[PDB]
Symmetry: D2
């Protein structure tokens, strides 16, 4: 029972950071593929992917580990961009070239998704405009700038506010639950129109001149919000509104990017080209933190190290993800078929799935009982569960996990 | 001439980020010890230490690389603290135990120095107080919260402001150049008194109730500001003022900590125990980014991964630094002796040295000509140079660098 | 043609301040009762009441003028509250005693409605809470604090923002036009529920902890917004939500108070007792500016003159208004009967009437042609007209104005 | 003893608003010339002028009262500028014509000094610049925008902050007490240089780009700060700095303007032409509140009433003040001669005098004992007394007051 002792001692020295309700503690020793092992030898099937960090497995993909060990002994990661280096150049080229839009783009590297978002804030404000529009339910980070854009759980913004002024939050086109009580699955256009109208006919009329809005920040699919997928043409309509006033569109792909939805960039599913994109988590292959902010060249700006290790890893990650897309979409069909009817709302694309329950207590029990069966799941939104297995998962491993989930749901 | 081509192509894809004046470009291939090698085979002696990131050499210390390669294959770095793990527990124990003060402390891990500072802002505001005092010339990071505390170069805060309200900046006790034109070396007490008076008799009288000031942020020695060392009893006096009103003291050791000044924590040189401390850069051994925010337990608060790789590395870093302190102070005497009279102001402690020139152009030339001789140096403040060789540097390597610097200064 | 010359010369020396579209210029010489006379001898029937300032006629009521001339020669108006004086005491007593709620209250005097609102902001924040909720379409003043709460026309908040942080705007229960496209006249409960739900299930869930919301600011009937009257039980429901979290209710009666709606305080029509109330405009009888902020005694706080002239006038105003209420409601029935079917939406209570047209151009023409007939009207909202004759208007004078309005509407 | 009863009852209904220490209560019935009479028949010689409001006597000047009674019966004061009217045109002409600078200017009317300052904030920000510099010890109003610029007593900014971001406060050139401990009377140039240096070499270097500073706000002589008169060439040097970066100079004359210092505009004593000027208090003749914001025409911008009563009064006030300047400067010599040696620092110009005592308790006693002798005085700064008799005071009345003050100072 090494775990209990480690947990107790750790709780003494570490700052408090738990969910509500809090999940069962896990003292991990190591990982392999889609499996995690605690210090007591217990095995766990991972359906969390570390929320993106481990899209390619644990501790990472074999080819990525190989790259890391080699590069680390040459030039590591100073989280700085001063030192020109081949790895940095190669990853930059891939990120600008494979991202949506065939216009010239540039990339700014950072150490995390929140830093990538902080950089995006600077980019959109470089225009001279002062206001930013974001969405209720959205999550973009915890640093002061990023948390000003975040609006997931009120408690997360407690005590230390107020936050950055000039940020306005509006309803997201959540097809299952929204302020208009519209069924976004049956009437997608109606929901999209109400959301666009709220911005254009109210926010832009009563509160802020649209010409002073620097940009609109959004997740192509809300992660922390509960894996909420908006109507297919929502971003096309949002862009129409934005273009009308010269407002920039910032696509936060920190959690949905790099293969999660079966596309290199989740926004591709919505056939929309954003002005700025943020990446992180999976970009580092599960080995290390690295963030990236891709943006139209015409928006460019005006430490002492070289981030070679992180970039070398990211470069390999991009190649593996691209090679895996067909597999991701194939395995995704299994989740689509097997998850049907397992929740009050079952929504997903690629390997990005969400299960929402009208009963929060039921949601908590499903996660709790699943953990007791050796299946790792994470909550999302108010009463949903995110089902996000590593992109490298096999059909066989997927069914092992789904069988456990189905059995748990049947008894809870 | 592989370098030129890499530089050109990289400038096309990467966001603009250069100094003023901009330093000579460097396309690094790999490093070993205190030496750096570019893609064209050119060798460089490093007197920058990556501003802390590479305190233990390039790409890092052999023992740290060993730890990294091993741990990376077990459980890497998710930049999250959810996953309990032995490495995390061990580093946490070292950071709370070896930091100043024998009272109970806790530690919150992050991915960088700016994130560590963002966390410290939340910690001091958890009290309910709204104002923060920082120092002119100080540098604490670039994210929205941290940059609100930063006041190094005005251009760095251009375009995208205003910033976080409630932050007040006051003069730092810079012994060489200050608003009072006091020679802080001859009259340290006078300078300290003027600085304390400015806060207590003006800021606290005219602008903000001291009882509403959450904390005072400071660097024990200003880094970006030009390696400005304040009078020895400055922090003792600052703490007296703070205790009087229940104001917290936040010691930013991101650049001066972990051995740079011959002490594990630079504040030790000032015999003062802070309430909160931030660490980063060197903590990750030059292999990866990791930040830490240490604070009194009574200030504690109320993702899904395990930062084992970064913590395992940090744990080893702490042991190596502690073992190296005697060496650092010994080599420091060489710099103290050899740097005398080489600038209009020569100031330093341990291996933290600053050379300030009344003539900025002269400062720029010294750095430029040194680069042409194969010696890497970084500017600081308005017209100073920071001389910060890796802590693992030998007497022989130190003299090679000092000989070059002396020769350059003599001809410029 | 003295007018044209005065207008031209005045436009040279005065700062630009015009509506869009701009109304016809008026160079007033004097007034009497409900009639205004320009410098060229042209007579105008006033249906604007100076938006409250002249509720009792022009230049004011005879009894008020008498009081003013007498008091002015004793102790005038220093816009200060330092000097104790009988007039101040008497008005204070009337304001605390006749305002809703039988609990102990206090009053803070100021010089305008925007200053009264600025004072209310301080009052609600004295609690220690940092957030404020206000309504889209609302208007509370133009000074920095008040304009942060205002959200009438975006252009009014242009250029000089961002504004006070921590202010969140939500939809008002406008029965004619709202984000839900609900007909608030046919389904009032549905609209009220959607508005309350937006705050409780979205704002309080995603954005801000309700326990940190200092207060909710609202107009009992939106003035600048277009004389928008919410469902009768809206404030009762709003108060239920507020009480649940200890949030204060601030009732801005600067435009709707003092008899306009047939009640001393417009909120009386909604059977709700607020925590704070702001008054201005009519309070000064049309003779001078004076604002008042009435609030529960338990919220009290912790220059060198005496506002006797303004208070003496206000005291008389209160008595005249109370005596006139029966008359106001009687004349109101005439407007109710005669205005029916004259606009796409006809809404009103007492002598507070609004006429909204789906066609903005039609709205502008009605106001313009009316001015050419000698009837003064003001626009409101996006395409509405406010019809607010002085409370002292006779049935005969009312019909003269209504006949003109009807004829204009019939030809436009 | 009618007073005591009025005070008790008034304290029950009125919001708390007292000084620290609090002055003796005064229940004023009426006034005449420079004399005030309470409800119990007690007579008081006024050396406060209501801090400007009553520069022309109590309740006001006979000629002003005449104008007021007449105009009030024609068109009063709606605190609005919509209604063109002769009085408004005439006052506007006088304010633009007689203010410093022969370039084209415009004027925006408001209801108070704080509103005039709020308007000035909008004017300087209309440029697009976001930062504002103000001075420690300064006072510009209590509304949210104005209080953000104010920095007199910290307690005044307690509880309800933080305030408007982008406002930076720097030391004022106070010749008696400043952060540099410079004797500004013996070494004025030294003090001016230190103040200019603080802004140019520190604020503009470390904190904010000067090109982003909209304006510098200042009082030509700090009022609440203690009637602090800066060196004669301070504003000339301040303007040189401002012109260098296109920064605007805002001169707040709300307390020092309109004859107080022997000049129509106090800045005239410093031979400097500002870009924006604010006026209030005395402008209304002691009869009513009216504010004015005068500014260069090239800075112009892009309710329903006519402020005729207030403007008619202001127009007369301007003529009387201009006629009285010779008298003010003459009587001023008496105060200069008679006040010498009566305090630790005696400073003044025209009829604007300040007496500072190193002993605060002594300062409080002088004011208290003076009140007991029937002489009204107000405190200022930390331990000073402002001596500001009405501009209409006779030599005989001045000596009566000075004799009392001298006797009190001799026994305290
Ligand atoms: C997780 C997440 C972030 C935060 O990324 P970090 O590396 O933890 O700072 C930002 N945006 C989105 C959409 C996320 O899911
Ligand atoms: C470099 C530095 C920071 C920034 O650390 P990052 O890891 O680059 O975010 C913060 N504070 C100080 C004192 C620094 O020197
Ligand atoms: C007009 C108005 C104000 C502004 O009053 P002022 O005296 O012009 O400052 C504030 N609130 C409401 C509801 C108003 O109608
Ligand atoms: C008194 C004063 C103000 C405030 O004027 P109000 O009419 O009370 O708002 C502003 N500035 C200065 C310099 C003052 O002395």
């Amino acid at each position: 029972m090494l775990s209990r002792k480690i947990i107790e001692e750790s709780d003494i020295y570490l700052a408090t950071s738990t969910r509500d309700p809090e999940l069962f503690p896990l003292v991990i020793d190591h990982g392999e593929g889609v499996w995690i092992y605690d210090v007591d030898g217990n095995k766990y099937l991972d359906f969390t992917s570390g929320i993106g960090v481990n899209n390619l497995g644990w501790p990472s993909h074999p080819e990525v580990i190989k790259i890391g060990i080699e590069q680390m002994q040459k030039l590591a990661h100073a989280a700085a961009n001063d030192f020109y280096n081949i790895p940095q150049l190669e990853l930059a080229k891939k990120l600008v070239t494979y991202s949506p839009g065939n216009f010239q783009k540039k990339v700014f590297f950072s150490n995390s998704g929140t830093e990538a978002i902080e950089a995006s804030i600077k980019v959109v404000k470089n225009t001279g405009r002062k206001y930013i529009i974001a969405f209720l339910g959205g999550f973009h980070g915890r640093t002061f700038g990023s948390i000003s854009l975040t609006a997931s759980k009120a408690v997360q913004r407690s005590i230390v506010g107020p936050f950055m002024p000039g940020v306005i939050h509006v309803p997201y086109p959540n097809p299952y639950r929204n302020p208009w009580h519209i069924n976004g699955y049956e009437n997608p256009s109606e929901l999209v129109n109400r959301v666009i109208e709220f911005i254009e006919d109210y926010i832009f009329v009563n509160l802020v001149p649209p010409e002073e809005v620097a940009g609109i920040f959004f997740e192509p699919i809300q992660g922390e919000g509960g894996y909420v997928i908006p109507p297919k043409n929502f971003f096309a309509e949002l862009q129409k509104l934005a273009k009308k006033y010269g407002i920039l569109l910032v696509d936060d792909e920190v959690q949905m990017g790099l293969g999660r939805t079966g596309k290199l960039f989740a926004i591709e599913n919505f056939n929309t080209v954003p002005d700025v994109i943020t990446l992180a988590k999976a970009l580092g292959g599960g080995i290390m933190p690295i963030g990236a902010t891709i943006f139209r060249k015409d928006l460019d700006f005006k430490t002492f190290g070289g981030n070679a290790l992180a970039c070398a890893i990211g470069s390999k990650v991009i190649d593996i993800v691209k090679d895996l897309l067909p597999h991701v979409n194939e395995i995704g069909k299994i989740f689509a078929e097997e998850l049907q009817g397992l929740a009050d709302d079952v929504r997903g694309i690629g390997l990005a799935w969400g299960l929402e329950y009208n009963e929060k207590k039921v949601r908590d029990r499903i996660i709790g009982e699943s953990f007791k069966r050796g299946l790792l799941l994470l909550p999302a939104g108010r009463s949903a569960i995110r089902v996000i297995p590593p992109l490298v998962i096999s059909e066989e491993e997927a069914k092992q996990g789904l069988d456990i989930l189905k059995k748990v749901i049947k008894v809870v």
